[PDB]
Amino acid sequence: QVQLVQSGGQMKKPGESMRISCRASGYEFIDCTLNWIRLAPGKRPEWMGWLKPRGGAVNYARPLQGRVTMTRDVYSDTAFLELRSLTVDDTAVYFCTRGKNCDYNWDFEHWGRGTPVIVSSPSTKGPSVFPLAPSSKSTSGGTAALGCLVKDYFPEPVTVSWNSGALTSGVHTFPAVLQSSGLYSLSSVVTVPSSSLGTQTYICNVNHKPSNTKVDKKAEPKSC
Amino acid sequence: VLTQSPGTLSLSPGETAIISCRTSQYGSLAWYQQRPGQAPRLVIYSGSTRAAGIPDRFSGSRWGPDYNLTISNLESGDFGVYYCQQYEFFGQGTKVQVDIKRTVAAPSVFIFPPSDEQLKSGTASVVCLLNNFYPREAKVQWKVDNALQSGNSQESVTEQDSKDSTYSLSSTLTLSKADYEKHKVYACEVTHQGLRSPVTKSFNRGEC
Amino acid sequence: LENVTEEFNMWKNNMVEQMHTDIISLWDQSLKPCVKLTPLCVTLQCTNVTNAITDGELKNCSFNMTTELRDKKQKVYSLFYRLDVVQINSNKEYRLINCNTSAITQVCPKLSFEPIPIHYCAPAGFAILKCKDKKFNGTGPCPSVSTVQCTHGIKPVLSTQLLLNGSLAEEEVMIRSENITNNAKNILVQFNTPVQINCTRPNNNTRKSIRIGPGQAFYATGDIIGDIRQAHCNVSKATWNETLGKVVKQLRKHFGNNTIIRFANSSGGDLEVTTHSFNCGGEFFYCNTSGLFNSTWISNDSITLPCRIKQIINMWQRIGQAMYAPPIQGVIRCVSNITGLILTRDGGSTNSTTETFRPGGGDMRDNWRSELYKYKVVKIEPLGVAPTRCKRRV
Amino acid sequence: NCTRPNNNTRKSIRIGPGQAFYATGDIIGDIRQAHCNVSKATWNETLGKVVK
Amino acid sequence: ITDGELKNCSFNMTTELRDKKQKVYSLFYRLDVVQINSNK
Ligand SMILES: *[C@@H]1O[C@H](CO)[C@@H](O[C@@H]2O[C@H](CO)[C@@H](O[C@@H]3O[C@H](CO)[C@@H](O)[C@H](O[C@H]4O[C@H](CO)[C@@H](O)[C@H](O)[C@@H]4O)[C@@H]3O)[C@H](O)[C@H]2NC(C)=O)[C@H](O)[C@H]1NC(C)=O
Ligand SMILES: *[C@@H]1O[C@H](CO)[C@@H](O[C@@H]2O[C@H](CO)[C@@H](O[C@@H]3O[C@H](CO)[C@@H](O)[C@H](O)[C@@H]3O)[C@H](O)[C@H]2NC(C)=O)[C@H](O)[C@H]1NC(C)=O
Ligand SMILES: *[C@@H]1O[C@H](CO)[C@@H](O[C@@H]2O[C@H](CO)[C@@H](O[C@@H]3O[C@H](CO)[C@@H](O)[C@H](O)[C@@H]3O)[C@H](O)[C@H]2NC(C)=O)[C@H](O)[C@H]1NC(C)=O
Ligand SMILES: *[C@@H]1O[C@H](CO)[C@@H](O[C@@H]2O[C@H](CO)[C@@H](O[C@@H]3O[C@H](CO)[C@@H](O)[C@H](O)[C@@H]3O)[C@H](O)[C@H]2NC(C)=O)[C@H](O)[C@H]1NC(C)=O
Ligand SMILES: *[C@@H]1O[C@H](CO)[C@@H](O[C@@H]2O[C@H](CO)[C@@H](O[C@@H]3O[C@H](CO)[C@@H](O)[C@H](O)[C@@H]3O)[C@H](O)[C@H]2NC(C)=O)[C@H](O)[C@H]1NC(C)=O
Ligand SMILES: *[C@@H]1O[C@H](CO)[C@@H](O[C@@H]2O[C@H](CO)[C@@H](O[C@@H]3O[C@H](CO)[C@@H](O)[C@H](O)[C@@H]3O)[C@H](O)[C@H]2NC(C)=O)[C@H](O)[C@H]1NC(C)=O
Ligand SMILES: *[C@@H]1O[C@H](CO)[C@@H](O[C@@H]2O[C@H](CO)[C@@H](O)[C@H](O)[C@H]2NC(C)=O)[C@H](O)[C@H]1NC(C)=O
Ligand SMILES: *[C@@H]1O[C@H](CO)[C@@H](O[C@@H]2O[C@H](CO)[C@@H](O)[C@H](O)[C@H]2NC(C)=O)[C@H](O)[C@H]1NC(C)=O
Ligand SMILES: *[C@@H]1O[C@H](CO)[C@@H](O[C@@H]2O[C@H](CO)[C@@H](O)[C@H](O)[C@H]2NC(C)=O)[C@H](O)[C@H]1NC(C)=O
Ligand SMILES: *[C@@H]1O[C@H](CO)[C@@H](O[C@@H]2O[C@H](CO)[C@@H](O)[C@H](O)[C@H]2NC(C)=O)[C@H](O)[C@H]1NC(C)=O
Ligand SMILES: *[C@@H]1O[C@H](CO)[C@@H](O[C@@H]2O[C@H](CO)[C@@H](O)[C@H](O)[C@H]2NC(C)=O)[C@H](O)[C@H]1NC(C)=O
Ligand SMILES: *[C@@H]1O[C@H](CO)[C@@H](O[C@@H]2O[C@H](CO)[C@@H](O)[C@H](O)[C@H]2NC(C)=O)[C@H](O)[C@H]1NC(C)=O
Ligand SMILES: *[C@@H]1O[C@H](CO)[C@@H](O[C@@H]2O[C@H](CO)[C@@H](O)[C@H](O)[C@H]2NC(C)=O)[C@H](O)[C@H]1NC(C)=O
Ligand SMILES: *[C@@H]1O[C@H](CO)[C@@H](O[C@@H]2O[C@H](CO)[C@@H](O)[C@H](O)[C@H]2NC(C)=O)[C@H](O)[C@H]1NC(C)=O
Ligand SMILES: *[C@@H]1O[C@H](CO)[C@@H](O[C@@H]2O[C@H](CO)[C@@H](O)[C@H](O)[C@H]2NC(C)=O)[C@H](O)[C@H]1NC(C)=O
Ligand SMILES: *[C@@H]1O[C@H](CO)[C@@H](O)[C@H](O)[C@H]1NC(C)=O
Ligand SMILES: *[C@@H]1O[C@H](CO)[C@@H](O)[C@H](O)[C@H]1NC(C)=O
Ligand SMILES: *[C@@H]1O[C@H](CO)[C@@H](O)[C@H](O)[C@H]1NC(C)=O
Ligand SMILES: *[C@@H]1O[C@H](CO)[C@@H](O)[C@H](O)[C@H]1NC(C)=O
Ligand SMILES: *[C@@H]1O[C@H](CO)[C@@H](O)[C@H](O)[C@H]1NC(C)=O
Ligand SMILES: *[C@@H]1O[C@H](CO)[C@@H](O)[C@H](O)[C@H]1NC(C)=O
Numbered sequence: 027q028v029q030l031v032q033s034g035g036q037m038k039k040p041g042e043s044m045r046i047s048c049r050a051s052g053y054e055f056i057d058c059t060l061n062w063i064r065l066a067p068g069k070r071p072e073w074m075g076w077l078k079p080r081g082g083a084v085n086y087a088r089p090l091q092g093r094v095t096m097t098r099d100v101y102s103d104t105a106f107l108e109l110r111s112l113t114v115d116d117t118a119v120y121f122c123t124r125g126k127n128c129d130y131n132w133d134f135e136h137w138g139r140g141t142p143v144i145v146s147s148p149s150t151k152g153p154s155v156f157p158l159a160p161s162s163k164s165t166s167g168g169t170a171a172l173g174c175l176v177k178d179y180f181p182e183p184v185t186v187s188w189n190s191g192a193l194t195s196g197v198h199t200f201p202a203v204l205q206s207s208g209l210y211s212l213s214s215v216v217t218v219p220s221s222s223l224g225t226q227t228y229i230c231n232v233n234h235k236p237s238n239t240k241v242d243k244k245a246e247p248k249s250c
Numbered sequence: 251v252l253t254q255s256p257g258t259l260s261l262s263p264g265e266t267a268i269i270s271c272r273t274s275q276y277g278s279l280a281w282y283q284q285r286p287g288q289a290p291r292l293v294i295y296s297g298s299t300r301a302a303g304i305p306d307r308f309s310g311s312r313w314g315p316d317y318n319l320t321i322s323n324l325e326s327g328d329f330g331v332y333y334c335q336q337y338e339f340f341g342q343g344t345k346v347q348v349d350i351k352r353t354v355a356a357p358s359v360f361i362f363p364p365s366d367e368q369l370k371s372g373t374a375s376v377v378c379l380l381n382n383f384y385p386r387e388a389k390v391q392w393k394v395d396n397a398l399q400s401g402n403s404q405e406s407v408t409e410q411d412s413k414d415s416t417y418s419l420s421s422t423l424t425l426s427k428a429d430y431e432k433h434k435v436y437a438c439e440v441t442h443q444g445l446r447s448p449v450t451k452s453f454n455r456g457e458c
Numbered sequence: 459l460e461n462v463t464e465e466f467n468m469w470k471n472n473m474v475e476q477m478h479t480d481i482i483s484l485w486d487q488s489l490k491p492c493v494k495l496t497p498l499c500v501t502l503q504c505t506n507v508t509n510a511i512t513d514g515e516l517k518n519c520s521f522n523m524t525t526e527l528r529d530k531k532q533k534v535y536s537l538f539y540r541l542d543v544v545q546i547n548s549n550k551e552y553r554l555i556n557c558n559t560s561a562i563t564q565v566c567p568k569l570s571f572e573p574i575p576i577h578y579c580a581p582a583g584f585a586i587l588k589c590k591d592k593k594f595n596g597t598g599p600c601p602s603v604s605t606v607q608c609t610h611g612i613k614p615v616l617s618t619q620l621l622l623n624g625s626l627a628e629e630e631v632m633i634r635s636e637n638i639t640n641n642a643k644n645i646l647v648q649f650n651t652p653v654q655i656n657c658t659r660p661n662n663n664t665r666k667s668i669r670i671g672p673g674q675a676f677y678a679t680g681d682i683i684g685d686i687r688q689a690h691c692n693v694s695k696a697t698w699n700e701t702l703g704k705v706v707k708q709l710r711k712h713f714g715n716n717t718i719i720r721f722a723n724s725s726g727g728d729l730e731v732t733t734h735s736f737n738c739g740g741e742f743f744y745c746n747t748s749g750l751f752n753s754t755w756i757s758n759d760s761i762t763l764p765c766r767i768k769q770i771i772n773m774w775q776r777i778g779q780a781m782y783a784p785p786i787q788g789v790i791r792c793v794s795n796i797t798g799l800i801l802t803r804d805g806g807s808t809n810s811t812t813e814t815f816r817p818g819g820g821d822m823r824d825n826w827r828s829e830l831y832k833y834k835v836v837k838i839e840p841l842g843v844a845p846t847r848c849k850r851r852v
Numbered sequence: 853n854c855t856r857p858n859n860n861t862r863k864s865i866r867i868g869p870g871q872a873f874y875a876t877g878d879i880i881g882d883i884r885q886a887h888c889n890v891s892k893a894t895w896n897e898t899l900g901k902v903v904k
Numbered sequence: 905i906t907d908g909e910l911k912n913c914s915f916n917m918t919t920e921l922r923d924k925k926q927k928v929y930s931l932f933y934r935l936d937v938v939q940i941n942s943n944k
Contacts, residue, residue: 860931863930865917865928865930866919866920867917867918868918868922869920875930875931876930876931876932877930877931878931879931882905882906883905883906883907883910884906885906885907885909
């Protein structure tokens with residue numbers, strides 16, 4: 027039964043080698059082409075290269091040369107892949123597939139389970155909490171965006187609450203907008219009614235636990 | 251090279267879903283199913299040939315560079331991410347998003363300035379709360395001085411919040427404080443199915 | 459055959475694959491009666507050869523073997539190339555290569571290997587067609603068909619990355635591939651003019667022998683009578699540099715215009731697929747050709763190609779098989795000419811500014827598909843009816 | 853129905869260059885004998901037919 | 905063991921080099937083992 031059993035986790039740190047492996051089974055290893063795909067989340071998937079058994083003849087993509095390397099052990103039916111000089115953008119799952127027959131390459135019948143390699147860098151990128159103020163003092167029938175933006179925080183995650191969990195419903199926690207700097211910025215707004223704006227100083231309680239800190243700021247109405 | 255559209259398929263169950271590529275060069279096409287969090291599987295191949303173990307509600311078309319995927323009678327095991335391969339190049343992925351049926355909604359444009367805590371530091375951040383939306387399929391128009399000056403922002407939405415079964419859209423700005431005086435005029439114009447015109451509401455920043 | 463138009467396809471032709479079957483059968487059914495070398499494996503203490511050497515790629519080993527009586531040790535020695543010797547872990551204890559995987563068989567040193575040309579002939583009730591015309595990218599129609607009994611001269615020469623002693627093209631360089639947009643396919647170029655190459659080696663080696671059991675003999679290398687220099691292989695920089703111009707010109711035609719074409723060496727694999735392997739006189743070479751392909755193309759000087767020699771080989775890229783090549787006395791001087799290239803293209807990013815081609819390999823079924831693209835085997839059917847104005851009277 | 857609770861292991865020993873001998877490794881579990889079950893009703897009323 | 909019908913033997917065999925002893929072991933059924941004539 028054609029089953030491709032991968033091997034490993036894992037987490038890494040930058041600038042180190044890494045090594046994964048595909049123990050193929052259920053077919054003649056010495057006769058069919060293998061393939062390698064880099065399913066990174068939220069982005070366009072990417073093929074990396076082949077490895078023909080029986081010769082060991084390889085091919086690689088062009089945005090990977092000088093770093094990627096493929097090889098096999100024909101006596102243990104085990105392909106291998108390595109990559110030097112991993113950056114933090116090399117977080118994904120690495121799949122190792124095979125086509126259906128052994129005549130056409132790109133027909134990815136069989137897939138393997140996935141080897142999610144995650145590179146983490148030491149980078150502070152601490153608290154930058156920007157609460158959002160309701161200018162409406164008390165507008166009867168109006169609802170304000172009592173929210174809070176975080177600027178250039180890293181790494182994941184980051185949360186937000188208000189006055190130790192006073193505002194729990196209506197918290198439209200918008201997804202984090204990845205800015206052009208490579209740093210994500212969280213946005214979050216809360217539907218708060220009219221008279222509740224000036225009733226208590228609702229403190230934007232953004233937890234910055236990946237930096238082991240937190241900054242709590244209020245979003246009182248302005249004066250202009 | 252490979253372009254997929256639309257990026258979001260907000261559909262109800264029991265319906266039909268249409269996803270379309272458009273290639274340039276000559277070569278076979280296939281569609282894969284990223285069933286969310288598992289190893290994907292090949293749904294269609296050779297342009298329009300089903301794979302083994304794949305139900306008959308899936309077929310391809312058409313002439314020239316254009317291609318489709320049909321998903322008749324959308325069920326639970328079909329909500330996922332859909333990829334379109336040509337030999338080695340993939341497409342960016344379309345998402346078939348589940349939607350429960352609701353009556354059309356009443357809009358509201360709520361735009362509020364940043365606080366005096368970190369406005370003065372040399373930054374700025376203005377949002378546009380857009381409550382009570384239906385459907386998901388909509389366009390945001392952050393108009394500044396009656397001109398689209400969004401830039402690096404993103405139409406980042408939440409889910410259909412099942413306490414009201416409504417959406418909440420947004421649009422932001424990443425401007426600095428040093429040229430913030432250029433953008434004192436704010437407007438959001440968002441249309442829907444229950445709207446003849448995009449909703450708008452002028453809010454001055456000389457009233458605080 | 460005037461007015462006859464057939465259609466050929468050189469990639470679905472089955473003359474190539476059944477020849478490949480029959481070639482590898484001949485190398486196996488011939489070596490049944492060729493001794494063996496099961497007792498060759500030993501701890502085999504070894505040093506460096508101390509001769510006048512311009513260069514540690516040749517070693518002076520020593521080992522115990524069995525004499526005529528099968529109860530007395532006999533301490534013998536011979537030379538081994540660097541690639542035949544493996545370190546296990548004072549002085550250094552080495553192991554023979556491919557002991558833990560396979561069994562080693564010495565090819566009998568009375569059997570010639572010289573590629574004598576082959577003529578394939580069809581039996582009765584069949585016929586062989588032949589497409590004499592030109593401008594044939596292996597498929598499509600053929601206006602000039604004939605009928606022959608036997609295919610022309612085919613010479614089984616097991617080379618890689620560069621076709622030697624092939625058949626030249628007609629007028630231009632003919633480039634043929636199954637599909638040019640498909641990267642998992644090889645490209646076959648065919649020259650309309652040869653480029654000559656000269657491989658030598660200053661060896662002048664000696665031959666020894668060791669009786670290994672009653673009636674068995676193992677032929678080893680004796681000593682070196684002369685000096686030591688490496689092997690090499692020369693190609694001229696004028697017939698070569700104005701051959702890739704012709705290949706660039708036909709490659710430029712498929713991909714378009716304003717395509718920068720780069721050539722670059724092999725990117726990885728087994729020794730068999732990243733080097734060129736000859737067979738001159740009964741020796742197996744492995745020459746570095748990364749200087750024929752290092753070039754970019756927009757809009758008495760020669761090239762020395764270094765070479766390595768190995769004696770325990772595995773011709774067919776199989777599992778558990780090896781053979782020991784016996785040495786030959788004298789200096790080898792072999793002249794050949796190159797008629798073709800096997801290329802492959804790197805996939806990857808969408809920049810229509812540069813394409814990069816590397817030497818391809820990994821398959822013996824491309825040396826032959828270059829030669830059997832002219833023929834197609836048909837089957838005769840003698841019966842047939844038609845209406846006429848003729849009546850059998852009873 | 854013949855069973856056996858074996859759950860044995862497989863080892864190997866290289867015995868000469870390119871030869872392999874497959875042996876039994878160890879026992880991962882307990883040891884019980886094999887057996888084979890037949891029903892006493894379909895059997896005891898089959899020999900009645902043969903006797904007849 | 906709920907039952908001496910399975911034995912744990914041990915023996916010398918030749919390794920990759922044909923000049924070094926290698927002491928190995930495996931299991932054998934009772935029927936594969938014959939007594940010739942301390943330990944056995
Ligand atoms: C195709 O051509 C490329 C060149 O464009 C070629 O890549 C080069 O390969 C060589 C080896 O073949 C590499 O050379 C090594 O370089 C390192 C420096 O990083 C040296 O330290 C190495 O020394 C080794 O050998 C010494 C003895 O000579 C030992 O004492 C030492 O400990 C090392 O083992 C070695 O010279 C080189 O890095 C690459 N790259 C470049 C840019 O040169 C490639 O090999 C060619 N393809 C094939 C199939 O040959
Ligand atoms: C490599 O293989 C592919 C796979 O077959 C070949 O693609 C096929 O190419 C032919 C010729 O261009 C296409 O046929 C034509 O399609 C157009 C569509 O508008 C039509 O107008 C023509 O009448 C004809 O039908 C065919 O569609 C195409 N196959 C696919 C799946 O797209 C390709 O040609 C091969 N390359 C080479 C160099 O042989
Ligand atoms: C590789 O090393 C081996 C052994 O170390 C060399 O073989 C030995 O070569 C020496 C040469 O100094 C021989 O010594 C001389 O031999 C003659 C005849 O045997 C004798 O009359 C002299 O008195 C002197 O001993 C030696 O016999 C020979 N053999 C052995 C078993 O030691 C070998 O020459 C080296 N390889 C090369 C290429 O030189
Ligand atoms: C490509 O074709 C040429 C033509 O046959 C091959 O050249 C021939 O190679 C053989 C190799 O054994 C030469 O034979 C040797 O000749 C010398 C002196 O003539 C003799 O001392 C040896 O005993 C041996 O017979 C032969 O001379 C040579 N040239 C000819 C026939 O004109 C070449 O080897 C082919 N390339 C490959 C890779 O096979
Ligand atoms: C096949 O031939 C190629 C082409 O010559 C070989 O590449 C060359 O290999 C040498 C030694 O491995 C390299 O020389 C070294 O270069 C460094 C550069 O700083 C220098 O510091 C050293 O002192 C030494 O000279 C050379 O750079 C390299 N690349 C070229 C010429 O582009 C290749 O190694 C050969 N392949 C095999 C498998 O033998
Ligand atoms: C049958 O008997 C043989 C030999 O009497 C057993 O093999 C030996 O089993 C023992 C278990 O106590 C091993 O001892 C331990 O081994 C590990 C790794 O070798 C070591 O770290 C410990 O300190 C301890 O020595 C011993 O190695 C092993 N092999 C030999 C050659 O003695 C075998 O287990 C018996 N059969 C069964 C089914 O248990
Ligand atoms: C070749 O055979 C000789 C003779 O058997 C080996 O010499 C023995 O080497 C071992 C190694 O420690 C010694 O313990 C013995 O005492 C030696 N015996 C004699 C009679 O000298 C020798 O090791 C073998 N191999 C090589 C490479 O020389
Ligand atoms: C046969 O022996 C060779 C001795 O070199 C083995 O090659 C080494 O094996 C180890 C263990 O897998 C690797 O870490 C090394 O990279 C190998 N090469 C070298 C040069 O040391 C070879 O693997 C053995 N064959 C088998 C089937 O195990
Ligand atoms: C290769 O080495 C052999 C020796 O093994 C050389 O043979 C000699 O040849 C010359 C004539 O060229 C004779 O006069 C000698 O008597 C020969 N020696 C022996 C021992 O027979 C042979 O010439 C060498 N070939 C070269 C130099 O290429
Ligand atoms: C192979 O090509 C080289 C490149 O020039 C030739 O080179 C030199 O030739 C002279 C004359 O014999 C020698 O003195 C040099 O030692 C040679 N150098 C090298 C690096 O070989 C060489 O003669 C050519 N030889 C053959 C047989 O083709
Ligand atoms: C390859 O070998 C051929 C055959 O020797 C060489 O061609 C001869 O080269 C010499 C130069 O010394 C000329 O005098 C001859 O006229 C050439 N032709 C013949 C038929 O002998 C050729 O030069 C070699 N190529 C190299 C060294 O790259
Ligand atoms: C392969 O191409 C490279 C790039 O041009 C060559 O590298 C240069 O070679 C010349 C002469 O060989 C040297 O003077 C330069 O110094 C080299 N460049 C650098 C950066 O050092 C290389 O020689 C080519 N190799 C072959 C065999 O053609
Ligand atoms: C027979 O023994 C093997 C061990 O050699 C058992 O394999 C284990 O199977 C379980 C699942 O049933 C896995 O979780 C273990 O990781 C396996 N162990 C190893 C070492 O692979 C096998 O299950 C046994 N079969 C039985 C009990 O009938
Ligand atoms: C084989 O037949 C025997 C006879 O009854 C069955 O016996 C017992 O089954 C229970 C339930 O598992 C066990 O606890 C006992 O240990 C069994 N005793 C014996 C002697 O086997 C037994 O289950 C049957 N098994 C099969 C596989 O047919
Ligand atoms: C022989 O094996 C068959 C197959 O398991 C047994 O038949 C089953 O026995 C179980 C009793 O646990 C029943 O529940 C099933 O209905 C039987 N049929 C099938 C198709 O599973 C049979 O009992 C065994 N005979 C013995 C133990 O003597
Ligand atoms: C002998 O060769 C080995 C490897 O070939 C090398 O490490 C050593 O330095 C050499 N010794 C001498 C004396 O040449
Ligand atoms: C190689 O060819 C190109 C194009 O003909 C030429 O410009 C270049 O000078 C040539 N180099 C040599 C060494 O002949
Ligand atoms: C490509 O260049 C050649 C130069 O001879 C020219 O004849 C041909 O028309 C060009 N083709 C295109 C499509 O530009
Ligand atoms: C090619 O090589 C052969 C043998 O070396 C030689 O006879 C022939 O003249 C060469 N040139 C050709 C066929 O153009
Ligand atoms: C076996 O068969 C005989 C005849 O049918 C019956 O008398 C006897 O009791 C049976 N025994 C069992 C154990 O069923
Ligand atoms: C070992 O087995 C033998 C025969 O199988 C038996 O005679 C002996 O008593 C057993 N000894 C032990 C300790 O089990």
